[PDB]
């Protein structure tokens, strides 16, 4: 689809994931793609320092 | 093709010179000897190796009709000179010298290979004849021949970094720059170990790592070594693969002085089976033992060779004589005792070790100037 | 030589010594003769614009004879022409090299 | 992760108590100051060991 | 007596000097300079001057009448325009800046970084930038 | 007459073009393999070959930020997108 609010979401949790079961290089990437993808919401003003 | 032919004759360094270890040798000598149209070495195996197959006629119609296939296109090439072009056309040899080095031999690679070198004046082609010279200098293992135009590759076809030609200076740190000048080639030399991945041609990377941590605790003691091969991150993936070399890295550095000789055994008993069987520890182990001792001999001035009974190692008479072959001859910079059982060590001075050095420098400057004072002025 | 220095006297005007030439500006910046290597026809996507180059400039070059069977001149300038940057200086640096 | 951050702390922490039970000697023996870290002396050996190396 | 003749020679600066900047030098003892008099000339210099002082185009003192190689300056003189000086700061404050810190570090990198990891560019292939552009909306 | 001659026309570029672009002006670096430059080449619809070598720079400009000589997949998917970014006017 073409969202983009929920798709930062999804990276952000599944950056979670990794680093709680221990999986450190997998989390560094879903989390960099969260990056460059919350590149382009006007208002994060909660999910910005979630993020942060 | 000739990029999985280095399993070739590195299995073929590895049969007969174990004269006992020669069972699973012959079962896949036979997928070397018959299959992949492997022609020469063999034959000049005939009072060498064992009794033999009938390799005769199933072989030499193999080399013949492959030849056949390739002997009348290379001689003659006149095909596309009938529109008139340069009377010639660049087809011909430069697409069939390959196989007179895979299959064909030194002497149709030598006469080919330079035949296409005057016929085109790039380094892109010079790229991949000179590599293939390298190649088939593993091959035949005439290995000083081919230590030539390595440095006549340093000099005209090196021209620097930059993704190039190193794709093939992977032919300038583990075929020719250190072998036997082994103590700082690899010293210097190792620094860069800045990719991973196994193309098609990248046939050797993990069993490749086990090499340079292998040679890697040589260079530096401790001025930080640690990083580049502990807090290193692509060295850490395979470590966290294979334990032989993780409890081996982790004996050292933790100084897990007692269990050195279990680790060294086991990388001892994986140079049981290793294909290296002609000069072997031009570096390691009784200077991995030094290397083990000048750590540990370090920090203690006042040590008793009771505490090495079970620090490092049992045998107190097996330590007692380990330290005396390895300070009698000029090394380990100590003094052992007798029955005080003391391990004492003495170190030269800021100064006396200088003017040591100062006048051996000295010396050799002095006769220097001696011979040409008297070269001119009669 | 004309473009020359030389000493002038103040009073008289007359000339004492010719003085060297500083450098050569047009050959001290002259063009470089660098290597012409390819990379080979592997530009796939241009070998529409490879074939009319291979028939223009190489065909004269290999071919001189068919020109001088047929009585018809052998071409001397080429022009490319499009956007900057899509190949218009390195195919004609790989092409040199095919020749 | 209270794993690493607490012991990687925790073994700076050592060194930090050592610099300055240390300092006002010059020559010590070993039992006093395994009794000024409260410790076992025999990671002591171990740990200064690694200090001077 | 020839460290008695160097110290005699010295009468001829005397401080009318005029100034010049050197240009080339054709042999020994023997030079071309450009004059701040607008033309050029063809000079002799003294065997005193210390020949590691030149070429950087150096700005160089001259006679007046005779109009010869006499004394090397100091090679920051002869500029016309100075540095910020010495207490010229505007007096703002890097954290006075609010919310560039993409084009804030960015910027700090482009200048002071380079004189330290100079060698990690050419281990790459970079080859680091000699300037840097700036633009934008006027304010 | 005679001096010059016949004039050859160059199309914008496509994708086996733009990736054959790419090695091209990625050849003189010290990369990092195990990377798909063939998504690289697909994530650019219409880019020129002059826009590819601005693409070289920005990696290994991250490669440098890294503290590495390593230029990874990383680099070149932040790097795609931040040159398109720059192309997003007209």
Redesign the interface.
């Known amino acids: 689809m073409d969202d983009k609010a929920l798709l930062v979401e999804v990276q952000l949790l599944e950056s979670k994931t990794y680093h709680a079961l221990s999986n450190l290089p997998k989390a560094r990437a879903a989390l960099t793609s969260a990056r460059t993808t919350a590149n382009a919401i006007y208002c994060p003003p909660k999910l910005q320092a979630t993020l942060d | 093709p000739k990029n999985p032919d280095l399993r070739i004759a590195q299995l073929r360094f590895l049969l007969s010179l174990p004269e006992h270890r020669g069972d699973a040798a012959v079962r896949d000598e036979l997928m070397a000897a018959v299959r992949d149209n492997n022609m020469a070495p063999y034959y000049e195996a005939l009072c060498k190796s064992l009794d033999w197959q009938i390799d005769v006629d199933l072989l030499n119609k193999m080399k013949k009709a492959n030849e056949d296939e390739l002997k009348r296109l290379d001689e003659e090439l006149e095909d596309a000179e009938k529109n008139l072009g340069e009377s010639e056309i660049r087809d011909a040899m430069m697409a069939k010298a390959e196989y007179l080095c895979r299959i064909g031999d030194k002497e149709g690679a030598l006469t080919a290979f330079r035949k296409t070198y005057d016929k085109t004046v790039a380094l892109g082609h010079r790229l991949d004849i000179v590599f293939y010279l390298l190649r088939i200098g593993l091959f035949y293992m005439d290995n000083d021949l081919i230590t030539r135009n390595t440095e006549k590759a340093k000099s005209l076809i090196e021209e620097g970094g930059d993704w190039d030609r190193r794709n093939r200076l992977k032919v300038y740190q583990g075929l020719y720059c250190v072998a036997i000048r082994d103590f700082k080639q690899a010293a210097e030399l190792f620094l860069d170990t800045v990719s991973t991945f196994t193309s098609y041609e990248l046939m050797d990377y993990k069993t490749f790592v086990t090499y340079t941590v292998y040679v890697s605790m040589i260079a530096l003691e401790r001025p930080d070594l640690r990083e580049k091969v502990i807090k290193g991150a692509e060295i850490l993936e395979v470590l966290h693969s294979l334990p032989a070399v993780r409890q081996y890295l982790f004996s050292l550095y933790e100084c897990r002085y007692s269990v050195f000789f279990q680790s060294l055994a086991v990388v001892e008993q994986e140079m049981k089976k290793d294909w290296l069987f002609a000069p072997h520890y031009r570096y390691y182990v009784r200077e991995m033992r030094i290397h083990a001792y000048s750590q540990l001999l370090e920090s203690y001035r006042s040590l008793t060779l009771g505490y090495m009974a079970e620090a490092f190692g049992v045998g107190v008479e097996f330590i007692d004589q380990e330290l005396s072959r390895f300070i009698a001859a000029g090394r380990l910079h100590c003094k052992i005792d007798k029955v005080n059982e003391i391990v004492e060590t003495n170190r030269p001075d800021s100064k006396n070790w200088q003017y040591q050095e100062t006048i051996k420098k000295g010396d050799l400057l002095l006769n220097r100037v001696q011979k040409l004072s008297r070269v001119i002025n009669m | 030589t004309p473009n020359c220095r030389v000493?002038?006297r103040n009073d008289s005007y007359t000339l004492?010594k010719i003085?060297?030439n500083?450098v050569d500006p047009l050959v001290s910046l002259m063009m470089v003769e660098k290597?012409?290597?390819?990379?080979y026809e592997?530009?796939?996507?241009?070998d529409k614009?490879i074939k009319?180059?291979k028939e223009?400039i190489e065909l004269p070059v290999?071919?001189p004879?068919?020109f001088e069977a047929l009585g018809i001149?052998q071409?001397?300038?080429?022009?490319?022409?499009?956007?900057?940057?899509?190949?218009?200086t390195?195919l004609a640096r790989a092409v040199a090299?095919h020749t | 992760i209270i794993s690493t951050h607490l012991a990687k702390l925790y073994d700076n922490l050592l060194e930090q108590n050592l610099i300055r039970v240390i300092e006002p000697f010059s020559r010590v023996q070993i039992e006093h100051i395994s009794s000024l870290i409260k410790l076992s002396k025999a990671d002591v050996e171990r740990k200064l060991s690694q200090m001077i190396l | 007596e020839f460290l008695h003749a160097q110290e005699e020679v010295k009468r001829i600066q005397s401080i009318p000097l005029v100034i010049g900047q050197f240009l080339e030098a054709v042999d020994q003892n023997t030079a071309i300079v450009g004059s701040t008099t607008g033309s050029n000339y063809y000079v002799r210099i003294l065997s005193t001057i210390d020949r590691e002082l030149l070429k950087p185009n150096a700005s160089v003192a001259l006679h007046k009448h005779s109009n010869a190689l006499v004394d090397v300056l100091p090679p920051e003189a002869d500029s016309s325009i100075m540095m910020l000086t010495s207490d010229q700061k505007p007096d703002v404050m890097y954290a006075d800046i609010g919310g560039m810190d993409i084009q804030k570090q960015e910027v700090r990198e482009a200048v002071e970084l380079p004189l330290t990891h100079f060698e990690l560019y050419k281990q790459i292939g970079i080859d680091p930038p000699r300037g840097v552009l700036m633009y934008g909306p006027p304010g | 007459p005679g001096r010059i001659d016949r004039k050859i026309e160059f199309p914008p570029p496509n994708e086996e073009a733009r990736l054959d672009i790419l090695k091209i002006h990625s050849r003189k670096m010290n990369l990092t393999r195990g990377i798909n430059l063939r998504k690289i080449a697909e994530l650019m619809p219409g880019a020129s070959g002059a826009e590819v070598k601005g693409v070289c720079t920005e990696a290994g400009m991250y490669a440098l930020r890294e503290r590495r000589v390593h230029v990874t997949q990383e680099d070149f998917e932040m790097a795609v997108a931040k040159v398109m970014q720059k192309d997003s006017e007209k």
């Open positions: 000493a002038l004492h003085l060297p500083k290597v012409p290597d390819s990379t592997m530009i796939g996507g241009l614009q009319e180059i223009v290999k071919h004879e068919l001149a071409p001397k300038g080429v022009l490319l022409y499009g956007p900057p940057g899509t190949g218009k390195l090299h």
